[PDB]
Symmetry: C5
Subunit: 242 residues, 5 copies
């Protein structure tokens, strides 16, 4: 296929997030070599378009964990690996060190479904993002303690309703997407956000810090990945001095 809108909106899709630092000797390469990089990045993404989709983000200067982030989706986990193998063979890839790499799967709603929580589910379904086009990405790995998991389905549902009630208002200016990672990475979830309004985003996270669910978090970041949304051309040119 593989269809972007489908891969971004259906259950059973694998999301593969990876962050990299550009090694110090990349900019010591001759200019000619660095000039060719941006086309090579766009072409490797095109080569794999039958199997994966790829988003690029610039993280340099907004955190110390990385210089860029790649978000890759496919219905086949190994296809995401294959893409990343070929990325690493590109000239930029060859001079990149991976600093984080977490995978997860999209799933149907476990908690705030029409059947389990109709009122909040209705508000989740009807919410519409209405701010300017997002400019920033945030990725937050989450892991919850054993005590969380050992609570009942009902106890957990209550806490997730409490998560949902004060955060629905932010769907006008923050896009969200949830991946499930237990067993696949040292995280239970990967959470992914797009916004143009980082003031609003800080307020959103503060609102979640303040609910009892947060008492169960053993990972809620580390790293908190903050970046700017960029096309692959712009990303690679920026990091290549082009």
């Amino acid at each position: 296929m593989a269809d972007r809108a489908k891969l971004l909106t259906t259950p059973g899709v694998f999301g593969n997030f990876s962050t990299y630092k550009v090694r110090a000797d990349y900019m010591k390469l001759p200019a000619a070599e660095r000039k060719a990089a941006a086309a090579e990045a766009q072409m490797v993404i095109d080569k794999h378009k039958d199997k994966v989709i790829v988003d690029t983000y610039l993280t340099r200067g907004l955190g110390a964990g990385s210089d860029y982030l790649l978000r890759v989706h496919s219905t086949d986990m190994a296809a995401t690996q294959a893409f990343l193998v070929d990325w690493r063979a590109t000239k930029l890839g060859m001079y990149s060190d991976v600093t984080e790499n977490l995978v997860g799967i999209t799933k149907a709603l476990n908690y705030i479904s029409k059947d389990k929580s109709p009122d909040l589910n209705a508000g989740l379904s009807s919410a519409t993002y209405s701010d300017s086009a997002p400019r920033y990405v945030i990725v937050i790995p989450v892991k919850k303690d054993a005590a969380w998991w050992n609570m009942s389905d009902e106890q957990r549902l209550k806490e997730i309703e409490v998560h949902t009630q004060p955060t629905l208002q932010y769907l006008v200016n923050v896009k969200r997407k949830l991946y499930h990672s237990t067993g696949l990475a040292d995280a239970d979830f990967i959470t992914y956000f797009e916004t143009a309004d980082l003031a609003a985003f800080n307020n959103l996270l503060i609102a979640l810090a303040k609910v009892p669910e947060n008492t169960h978090h053993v990972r809620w970041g580390n790293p908190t990945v903050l970046g700017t949304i960029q096309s692959a051309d712009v990303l690679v040119k920026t990091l290549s001095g082009m």
Copy 2:
């Protein structure tokens, strides 16, 4: 020739797991040196075939901890070491940084034995893998807190029965193998899994998160090693640009 099926299915076998990152200057080597790497790898595996067996897996692009994983078995722990010393002397080996290296021994059933828990023991012996051939490997180091070990044999049996109850159904599509590591590594166990269905694997680990045994884990991953199963030839070629 050492007996692979026996080494994989009997108590008293040492399992030696090691993950490596490929150094950034490997891909800078002349093509001839990289093209020779695949045959060096098969020659070292062949050299030690009287005493050890070896499995290879590609972890690049599915986690930040490593690019590949080796699983090595022998009844002699020093023979696994001798194999890895010779592996590190190969060209790929020489350009690999070891990132984790854990060993353990296979044992008889401690808990879910015919003597102690016959119904679940038959449930276990019962079970059969029925899905297509596994594509993925997952390795999860586990360590339990002092409170666990200080519980009685009966208290621990009960919690291991509870571990077993929800997981028996996953033997249709996940293969498992347990090694014991207390005193030989900073882990009590190494756990090893093969599957074609990472959606199912995620669900299996969630089920285990929800039981009281999990309140005792101080290590349950870190790293959670996720890879694809590959022949040695394909692994080495992939990482060599061949």
Copy 3:
């Protein structure tokens, strides 16, 4: 001439982004030929000038006062992406190219949450009237702060009481310590970045001791790590120092 960014306004209004980054100079920087190291100072001033309509930049030397870094940059803008763009250009300079980032935290300035005129009028009056009266600051301290879930799960009133207790014994240090607060939850692995300027590190040690002793401190899961200590330096002096020039 487009107008420069307004420094005094950026440093005193809510809704400004502060970007803090610390770096180690790589070993091979000093192996560069002398002329290259000699040109580094001008390159630094040109990149700061290139971005002068959108950001402001402060430089501090941290080498010898901690193991985490050799220098600190503090960059402000109303546009987070513009702080990024300056730092991207900084990394392209000769010194930047030989700098490894060791920490980089961002946050936003905000209105008072607790010690406002409506919520705590006496302490707010003491905060608003205090004046720094010592000689010009020579040192910077940056302390990242993160509070546990239990803190955030406390009610508004419970938190206010603890921030009143934070404030009561620290007002007296406003005569010899300047402070600035940034808010980071969601944007970094911290809730706050705190920034201080002083000439008197004996006083600063006493100030932090006073805050260690209050119940609020029972909730910190990060209070430093790193505690970044440095000297205030011009860009020119910072770069020449790290370049042996």
Copy 4:
């Protein structure tokens, strides 16, 4: 010329444990430089034989913390340092990165003395190693929490008797040696073991995990150093491709 037997069996002796990784560019050295490494190692050991004894062990392939371990004893701590300073000036030393280096002192029995615990002291005294010569070394750094040390002498005696009771039986196939490190390193103890039987060693450590003393451990490994006993000549040649 230092007396090995006495240094290994008397109180007041300093034990100096250090582990090292061999740098990636050692094997890139001309064959003739690596060929001389083993004689350089023997000469430095001989140079210091009036003040120290040295044991060598190969850890490569049995853990990720190191490639080799040195255990050095002297009545003068500074002599242990002087040896290691000279070791680091050898060709192999120059290409070695230290990854852990702990020191401690041997002491008289604090707990299981004839006066305080006569029955267990008798079993300790009469126990005899009866297995084949050891092939493996294990080093476990240990640190206990403030609550341990704040317990009374009698409370601690009780727990060390509980340590000793189920472990005396392993003296038949495990040799032990205790060093005390509080104030000299980030450990209260360094524990040292030699065995031919790692299956027995795993069961020994399991038995100690189960006793209440274990609730006080804040370090009990990290690293758990596992290696093989080797002569210095074999060790250096093995790491030099000779």
Copy 5:
């Protein structure tokens, strides 16, 4: 202006402690360059003699955190920085990586003053150091939990009285100096010790582990820096192969 005796014995003095590893390529430099290093080191200490004093210690082979330690005092913190900046520009400095660097200030007695605790204060004088000249240094960074600082002045005094009681008997063989670091480093204190008798020092720290003050330590080492006292000339020559 700087007077050593006075900088070492008065309140209001900044102490700056830094540890370094020597990079692996230092010994690859020509012999002539390394021969010149000791003089350069001595001349940089001289250059700053009007503002700072400098002590040097060799830590290689007594721990993995460093190869040498510098202790620098001045009444001006920035002067200690200026000195270390110039040190890093020396040949050895240029090939040194800083691994820890902590500062603090000397203060009058907070607890065991004549006014507050006259008996123990007198007792600080009931023995004088009487052993052979010190050969070893130990530096232990200390940080206490919030619960400590939240105790009353009176409660804390009682605990520091309890700290001082067992400690008096080691005045014959351990010299001590205390620095205060809260707000300046990730520590509340830096403690500094000189001794010839590491058996004694081990016993001293054991005695301190056993008192209730120890339940409040979140840092008490990490690193525990152990070294030998050396002149700058002997230090730099030893690390330079000269």
